[PDB]
Short mmCIF file of all heavy atoms in Angstrom, two decimals:
data_model
loop_
_atom_site.label_atom_id
_atom_site.label_comp_id
_atom_site.label_asym_id
_atom_site.label_seq_id
_atom_site.Cartn_x
_atom_site.Cartn_y
_atom_site.Cartn_z
N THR E 5 18.70 -118.17 -69.77
CA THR E 5 18.57 -119.06 -70.91
C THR E 5 19.64 -118.66 -71.94
O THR E 5 19.28 -118.47 -73.19
CB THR E 5 17.15 -119.08 -71.58
OG1 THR E 5 16.24 -118.87 -70.56
CG2 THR E 5 16.86 -120.39 -72.27
N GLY E 6 20.87 -118.49 -71.59
CA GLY E 6 21.93 -118.04 -72.47
C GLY E 6 22.18 -116.55 -72.38
O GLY E 6 23.17 -116.03 -72.79
N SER E 15 19.99 -109.03 -71.07
CA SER E 15 18.80 -109.85 -70.88
C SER E 15 17.66 -109.20 -71.51
O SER E 15 17.71 -107.99 -71.83
CB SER E 15 18.58 -110.02 -69.33
OG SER E 15 18.01 -108.81 -68.82
N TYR E 25 25.91 -111.47 -60.89
CA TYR E 25 26.55 -112.66 -60.33
C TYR E 25 27.81 -112.32 -59.64
O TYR E 25 28.02 -112.82 -58.45
CB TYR E 25 26.81 -113.73 -61.42
CG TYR E 25 25.59 -114.32 -62.05
CD1 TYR E 25 25.67 -115.08 -63.19
CD2 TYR E 25 24.34 -114.05 -61.59
CE1 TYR E 25 24.57 -115.67 -63.80
CE2 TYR E 25 23.22 -114.64 -62.17
CZ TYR E 25 23.35 -115.41 -63.27
OH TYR E 25 22.20 -115.99 -63.89
N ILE E 37 33.24 -102.97 -43.25
CA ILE E 37 32.63 -101.66 -43.10
C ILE E 37 33.66 -100.57 -42.99
O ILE E 37 34.85 -100.83 -42.70
CB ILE E 37 31.72 -101.59 -41.86
CG1 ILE E 37 32.57 -101.29 -40.56
CG2 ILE E 37 30.89 -102.79 -41.72
CD1 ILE E 37 31.69 -101.06 -39.37
N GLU E 50 35.87 -107.78 -41.01
CA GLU E 50 35.67 -109.05 -40.47
C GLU E 50 36.45 -110.09 -41.25
O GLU E 50 35.91 -110.65 -42.20
CB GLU E 50 34.14 -109.40 -40.48
CG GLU E 50 33.76 -110.76 -39.93
CD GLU E 50 32.42 -111.18 -40.46
OE1 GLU E 50 31.77 -110.44 -41.22
OE2 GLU E 50 32.01 -112.32 -40.11
N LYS E 51 37.68 -110.35 -40.95
CA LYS E 51 38.49 -111.31 -41.62
C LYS E 51 38.37 -112.72 -41.07
O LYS E 51 39.00 -113.07 -40.14
CB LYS E 51 40.02 -110.87 -41.60
CG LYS E 51 40.91 -111.71 -42.42
CD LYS E 51 42.26 -111.15 -42.49
CE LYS E 51 42.92 -111.04 -41.06
NZ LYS E 51 44.32 -110.50 -41.16
N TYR E 58 47.07 -120.68 -40.19
CA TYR E 58 47.45 -119.42 -40.90
C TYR E 58 47.99 -118.40 -39.86
O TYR E 58 47.46 -118.27 -38.77
CB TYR E 58 46.20 -118.84 -41.60
CG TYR E 58 45.82 -119.66 -42.84
CD1 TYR E 58 44.45 -119.63 -43.25
CD2 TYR E 58 46.67 -120.45 -43.55
CE1 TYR E 58 44.09 -120.39 -44.37
CE2 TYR E 58 46.33 -121.16 -44.63
CZ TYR E 58 44.97 -121.11 -45.02
OH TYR E 58 44.62 -121.88 -46.13
N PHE E 67 44.35 -102.55 -47.57
CA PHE E 67 45.51 -102.26 -48.37
C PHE E 67 45.94 -100.81 -48.25
O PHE E 67 45.13 -99.96 -48.10
CB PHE E 67 45.32 -102.65 -49.81
CG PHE E 67 45.09 -104.11 -50.05
CD1 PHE E 67 43.84 -104.66 -50.02
CD2 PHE E 67 46.24 -104.98 -50.26
CE1 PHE E 67 43.62 -106.04 -50.22
CE2 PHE E 67 46.02 -106.34 -50.43
CZ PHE E 67 44.73 -106.86 -50.46
N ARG E 71 50.02 -93.42 -49.97
CA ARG E 71 50.47 -92.97 -48.63
C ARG E 71 49.34 -92.16 -47.94
O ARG E 71 49.40 -92.00 -46.68
CB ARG E 71 51.75 -92.14 -48.70
CG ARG E 71 51.65 -90.92 -49.55
CD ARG E 71 53.00 -90.15 -49.53
NE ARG E 71 52.96 -88.98 -50.45
CZ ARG E 71 53.99 -88.16 -50.66
NH1 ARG E 71 55.13 -88.35 -50.05
NH2 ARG E 71 53.91 -87.20 -51.52
N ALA E 91 44.84 -99.51 -58.70
CA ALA E 91 44.63 -98.25 -57.95
C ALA E 91 45.99 -97.57 -57.63
O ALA E 91 46.24 -96.39 -57.85
CB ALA E 91 43.84 -98.52 -56.71
N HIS E 110 39.05 -88.45 -57.71
CA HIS E 110 39.57 -88.73 -59.05
C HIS E 110 40.07 -90.21 -59.05
O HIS E 110 39.85 -90.84 -60.10
CB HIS E 110 40.68 -87.81 -59.38
CG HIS E 110 41.15 -87.88 -60.76
ND1 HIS E 110 42.47 -87.73 -61.16
CD2 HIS E 110 40.42 -88.10 -61.87
CE1 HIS E 110 42.57 -87.81 -62.47
NE2 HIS E 110 41.36 -88.04 -62.92
N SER E 126 32.82 -110.07 -73.92
CA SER E 126 32.73 -111.48 -73.66
C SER E 126 34.16 -112.01 -73.43
O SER E 126 34.38 -113.10 -73.04
CB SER E 126 32.11 -112.20 -74.84
OG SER E 126 32.91 -112.20 -75.92
N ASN E 143 43.32 -79.60 -47.25
CA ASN E 143 42.80 -78.86 -48.38
C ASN E 143 41.65 -79.52 -49.06
O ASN E 143 40.84 -78.98 -49.74
CB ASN E 143 43.88 -78.55 -49.41
N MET E 150 33.11 -95.69 -52.53
CA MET E 150 32.86 -97.13 -52.75
C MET E 150 32.56 -97.45 -54.17
O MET E 150 31.81 -96.72 -54.89
CB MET E 150 31.72 -97.58 -51.77
CG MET E 150 31.74 -99.04 -51.58
SD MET E 150 30.68 -99.97 -52.75
CE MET E 150 29.02 -99.59 -52.26
N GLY E 166 29.31 -106.83 -48.07
CA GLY E 166 29.47 -108.24 -47.70
C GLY E 166 28.17 -108.91 -47.30
O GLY E 166 27.11 -108.45 -47.68
N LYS E 167 28.24 -109.96 -46.47
CA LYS E 167 27.07 -110.72 -45.96
C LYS E 167 26.04 -109.80 -45.34
O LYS E 167 24.98 -109.61 -45.88
CB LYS E 167 27.54 -111.74 -44.97
CG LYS E 167 28.43 -112.87 -45.50
CD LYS E 167 29.00 -113.68 -44.40
CE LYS E 167 29.84 -114.84 -44.92
NZ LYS E 167 29.09 -115.83 -45.72
N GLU E 183 30.00 -85.60 -36.26
CA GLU E 183 30.45 -84.79 -35.10
C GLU E 183 31.52 -85.52 -34.32
O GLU E 183 32.31 -84.94 -33.55
CB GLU E 183 29.27 -84.39 -34.17
CG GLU E 183 28.15 -83.78 -34.89
CD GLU E 183 28.46 -82.47 -35.62
OE1 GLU E 183 29.33 -81.70 -35.02
OE2 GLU E 183 27.96 -82.16 -36.64
N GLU E 203 28.46 -115.78 -34.96
CA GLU E 203 29.37 -116.66 -34.27
C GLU E 203 28.97 -118.16 -34.54
O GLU E 203 29.76 -119.11 -34.24
CB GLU E 203 29.43 -116.40 -32.80
N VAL E 204 27.74 -118.36 -35.02
CA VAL E 204 27.17 -119.69 -35.25
C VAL E 204 27.69 -120.33 -36.58
O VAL E 204 28.41 -121.28 -36.59
CB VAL E 204 25.67 -119.75 -35.15
CG1 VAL E 204 25.16 -121.13 -35.41
CG2 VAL E 204 25.19 -119.20 -33.80
N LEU E 211 39.80 -109.35 -36.49
CA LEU E 211 39.39 -108.03 -36.82
C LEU E 211 40.42 -107.13 -37.30
O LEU E 211 41.49 -106.97 -36.64
CB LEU E 211 38.68 -107.37 -35.61
CG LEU E 211 38.36 -105.90 -35.70
CD1 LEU E 211 37.35 -105.67 -36.77
CD2 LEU E 211 37.93 -105.34 -34.42
N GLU E 234 41.76 -102.26 -27.33
CA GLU E 234 40.84 -101.47 -26.58
C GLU E 234 39.47 -101.54 -27.25
O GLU E 234 38.45 -101.78 -26.51
CB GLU E 234 41.32 -100.01 -26.54
CG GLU E 234 40.40 -99.01 -25.87
CD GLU E 234 41.00 -97.67 -25.71
OE1 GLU E 234 42.23 -97.54 -25.63
OE2 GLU E 234 40.23 -96.72 -25.58
#
Side-chain angles (χ1 to χ4, degrees), chain E residues 5-6 15 25 37 50-51 58 67 71 91 110 126 150 166-167 183 204 211 234:
Chain E
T5 327
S15 72
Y25 291 172
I37 81 173
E50 177 202 2
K51 184 173 62 180
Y58 292 153
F67 295 92
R71 58 180 176 181
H110 191 217
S126 70
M150 199 270 289
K167 294 170 180 297
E183 309 299 326
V204 180
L211 169 65
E234 176 173 337

